[PDB]
RNA sequence: CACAUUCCAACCACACCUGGCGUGUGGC
DNA sequence: TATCCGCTCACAATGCCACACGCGCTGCTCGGCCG
């Protein structure tokens, strides 16, 4: 029998994702499930196949508690006199041996646990190797699109997920194109979707800058705050530690080229880049650009900013859905 | 409307063009599908079409016109031709065909080439009269392909030392024995820029197989030449297909008396793909590599030759060694004694921040006297005599210092006196 | 210029196995 | 050449099912030969 388990442990194709130790512990869990299915009772046990010495064996777990239900896993907190427990809780025994691990039900449950854990192991390895990319822009091809979630192939058995809020209300994709995005959420213990990648943010735009601007990356133009209505607007107020570097002159570029390049990379999104000030009044004056206001009432007790606009600039100070305000309000 | 002048346009330009043509939101379909729909509508407005593409004959006998940007893949933007045209104009694999094309019909899924106006940049009448590539008589390289740029920058040295290590000519067979972490991509970029500046007459062909996509997008818009690559996101089928078809294109170009040069990276991964695509031969040697699995790569490597009648096919293939792979070990063992031009790169110098990490004594070129006059012959002989007793890293750094001390190889030869 | 085979969203097509001949046995 | 007769060779003597079983001029020499 040990020859069969040695053959199945050596015949693993992805020995990296599942080395001998975790493969043997998977087989241990499978044999424990098989033993559970053997007896009508529900007793959890361990195997300890003895990877390199010889064949396998089985133990019996107690999980010492004051309960009595399923006495196969019931031992009182003081039953440590004879049989050499000596501890309060956690004392287990090797009582049960002679576990059949080759019949039809055993083989079926073994294959089930093996496939479940190879899925778990590939998930764990891909998340551990591509999680540090959280905050960077990575490309990838989509392979399935649905009304609630879409999948992405990154390569080397790497699967990324994009939800509905992860996509723009009007952006579009289909299996075959190479889309880029930043990974924002990570769940190395998730059962399904693992690599929550999207853009859906202005900080993603910041990363875009870090990729497209050689100056950005050494903190030459500090980005203070930014808000984005997806596919609609991108308000952003940045500062500059230097006095000769103009943010609306450098970050915007020449005759509106860098901002227009980012807009056409996002699919025509109006981006308002403005200079940050050390006062909330002038900050919100400049944030509603393009506009012209001469009313500032800031209240830190009520967190209120009364910024009245001149009659005529209303449609320019509010915009569609209150954009120039709703972004500035956030 | 030509296919190239429409496809090399940016994706956003295609989206705006389709939206101006009165279509659904084009952000859903892929680039090939966008091109297909755009051509469908542009033909629905009349507009007799003019297309082009590289020919591929399938097992049935018909032909498909693949495009260069899609790395010669199958898509709705493909042009179908019946075997009747192939029998009439005497076409073959690798022949780029350009001419008039029409809209498709119901039940048809591809366009039809009506009449060809260009075959491999030639008259369609002379397309049937061309000597086969196999019937040609190979020879040694005679015309020297100088790689010296002449500006003496921090990158030109990369080619200068090259010309100081192993001369290269038209139709030469080249191997690059370099371990990883060495900068083979930098060497390829330098040699591509050198061949684009010095010899713009000969067509440059650069191929990247089983490569990461970043290098693909870098090479596709950095060098002056038609860049076709194939990333690892596809099975070995596409790899071997693009290899066969690019070598067929090169053979057709040489048959049309054109000097072609193929930069390949890497021959090891291509041999890996050729091994995993071919069925088993019955037995197995060390490394899991089949016996006949290397027949196709070896052929690919032997296709390079200097034609006596006209044209040439130079190849420079990079090999992966020192990777701890049994498969790569046996592949390099097989490919070692195969070519006449080899360049060995030292990993110890590579990851010692001494670029370009070259190995002088290990590298060389057979029949190098046919690619250089007596002057550079004696100069290189003196250089080899003075560098042989020296070590590896010290000699490399001394040579690169004496090279950077000047602009070109002539000034170095003069200062060596 | 012309006939023109147009290659692998649910799913339709990808479905199955012995008296050839003799002999023997039994019932109507 | 009749004509009955004999020889002998070619053509017959229900018709349904159920089950079982099976391989008796091919092994050793001479003549062939287009993917």
From TrEMBL, chain A:
GO terms for cellular component: cytosol. It comes from the Bacteria. It is found in: Cytoplasm. Residues 135-200 form the S1 motif domain. Keywords: Cytoplasm, Elongation factor, Protein biosynthesis, Repeat, RNA-binding, Transcription, Transcription antitermination, Transcription regulation, Transcription termination. GO terms for molecular function: DNA-binding transcription factor activity; nucleotide binding; RNA binding; translation elongation factor activity. GO terms for biological process: DNA-templated transcription termination; transcription antitermination. Belongs to the NusA family. Participates in both transcription termination and antitermination. Monomer. Binds directly to the core enzyme of the DNA-dependent RNA polymerase and to nascent RNA. This is Transcription termination/antitermination protein NusA. It comes from Escherichia coli. The lineage of its organism: Bacteria, Pseudomonadati, Pseudomonadota, Gammaproteobacteria, Enterobacterales.
């Amino acid at each position: 029998m040990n020859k069969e388990i040695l053959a199945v442990v050596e015949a693993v194709s992805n020995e990296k994702a599942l080395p001998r130790e975790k493969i043997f512990e998977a087989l241990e869990s499978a044999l424990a499930t098989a033993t559970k299915k053997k007896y009508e009772q529900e007793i959890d046990v361990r195997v300890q196949i003895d990877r390199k010495s010889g064949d396998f064996d089985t133990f019996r777990r107690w999980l010492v508690v004051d309960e009595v239900t399923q006495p196969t896993k019931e031992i009182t907190l003081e039953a440590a006199r004879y049989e050499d427990e000596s501890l309060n809780l956690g004392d287990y025994v090797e009582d049960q041996i002679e576990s059949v691990t080759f019949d039809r039900i055993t083989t079926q449950t073994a294959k089930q646990v093996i496939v479940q854990k190879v899925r778990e192991a590939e998930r764990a390895m891909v998340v551990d190797q591509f999680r540090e990319h959280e905050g960077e822009i990575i490309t990838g091809v989509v392979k399935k699109v649905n009304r609630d979630n879409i999948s992405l192939d990154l390569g080397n058995n790497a699967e990324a997920v994009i939800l509905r809020e992860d996509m723009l209300p009007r952006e579009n994709f289909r299996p075959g194109d190479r889309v880029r995005g930043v990974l924002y959420s990570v769940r190395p213990e998730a059962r399904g979707a693992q690599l929550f990648v999207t853009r859906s943010k202005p900080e993603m735009l910041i990363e875009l800058f870090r990729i497209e601007v050689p100056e950005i990356g050494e903190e030459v133009i500090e980005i203070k705050a930014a808000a984005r209505d997806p596919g609609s607007r991108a308000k952003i107020a940045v500062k500059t530690n230097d006095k000769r570097i103009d943010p609306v002159g450098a970050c915007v570029g020449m005759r509106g080229a860098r901002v227009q390049a980012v807009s056409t990379e996002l699919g025509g999104e109006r981006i308002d880049i403005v200079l940050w000030d050390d006062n909330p009044a002038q900050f919100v004056i400049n944030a509603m650009a393009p506009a012209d206001v001469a009313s500032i009432v800031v209240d830190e007790d009520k967190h209120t900013m009364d910024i009245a606009v001149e009659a005529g600039n209303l449609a320019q100070a509010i915009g569609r859905n209150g954009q120039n305000v709703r972004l500035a309000s956030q | 409307m030509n296919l190239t002048e429409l496809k090399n346009t940016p994706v956003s330009e295609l989206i705006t063009l389709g939206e101006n043509m009165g279509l659904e939101n084009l952000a859903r379909m892929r680039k090939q599908d966008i091109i297909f729909a755009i051509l469908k509508q542009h033909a629905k407005s009349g507009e007799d079409i003019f297309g082009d593409g590289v020919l591929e004959i399938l097992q049935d006998g018909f032909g498909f016109l693949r495009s260069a940007d899609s790395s010669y893949l199958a898509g709705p933007d493909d042009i179908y031709v019946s075997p009747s045209q192939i029998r009439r104009f005497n076409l073959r694999t690798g022949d780029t065909i350009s001419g008039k094309i029409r809209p498709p019909k119901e039940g048809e899924r591809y366009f039809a080439l009506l009449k060809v106006n260009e075959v491999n940049f030639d008259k369609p009448e002379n397309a049937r009269n061309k000597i086969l590539f196999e019937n040609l008589t190979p020879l040694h390289a005679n015309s020297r392909l100088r790689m010296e740029r002449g500006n003496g920058s921090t990158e030109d040295l990369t080619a200068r030392v090259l010309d100081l290590a192993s001369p290269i000519g038209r139709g030469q067979r080249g191997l690059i024995v370099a371990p990883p972490k060495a900068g083979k991509t930098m060497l390829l970029q330098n040699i591509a820029q050198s061949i684009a500046y010095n010899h713009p007459d000969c067509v440059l062909m650069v191929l990247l197989i089983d490569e990461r996509p970043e290098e693909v997008t870098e090479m596709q818009r950095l060098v002056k030449g038609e860049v076709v690559a194939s990333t690892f996101d596809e099975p070995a089928s596409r790899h071997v297909q693009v290899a066969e078809m690019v070598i067929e294109k090169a053979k057709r170009l040489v048959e049309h008396k054109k000097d072609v040069i193929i930069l390949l990276d890497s021959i090891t991964r291509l041999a890996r793909a050729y091994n995993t695509v071919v069925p088993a031969s019955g037995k197995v040697l060390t490394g899991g590599v089949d016996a006949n699995a290397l027949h196709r790569p070896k052929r690919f490597f032997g296709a390079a030759r200097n034609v006596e009648e006209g044209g040439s096919l130079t190849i420079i293939a990079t090999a992966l060694i020192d990777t701890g792979s049994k498969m790569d070990e046996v592949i390099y063992e097989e490919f070692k004694g195969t070519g006449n031009m080899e360049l060995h790169l030292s990993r110890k110098i590579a990851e010692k921040r001494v670029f370009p990490a070259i190995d002088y004594n290990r590298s060389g070129t057979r029949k190098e006297e046919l690619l250089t006059t007596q002057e550079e012959l004696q100069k290189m002989w003196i250089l080899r005599k003075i560098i042989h007793p020296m070590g590896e890293i010290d000699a490399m750094e001394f040579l690169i210092n004496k090279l950077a001390m000047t602009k070109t190889n002539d000034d170095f030869f003069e200062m060596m006196k």
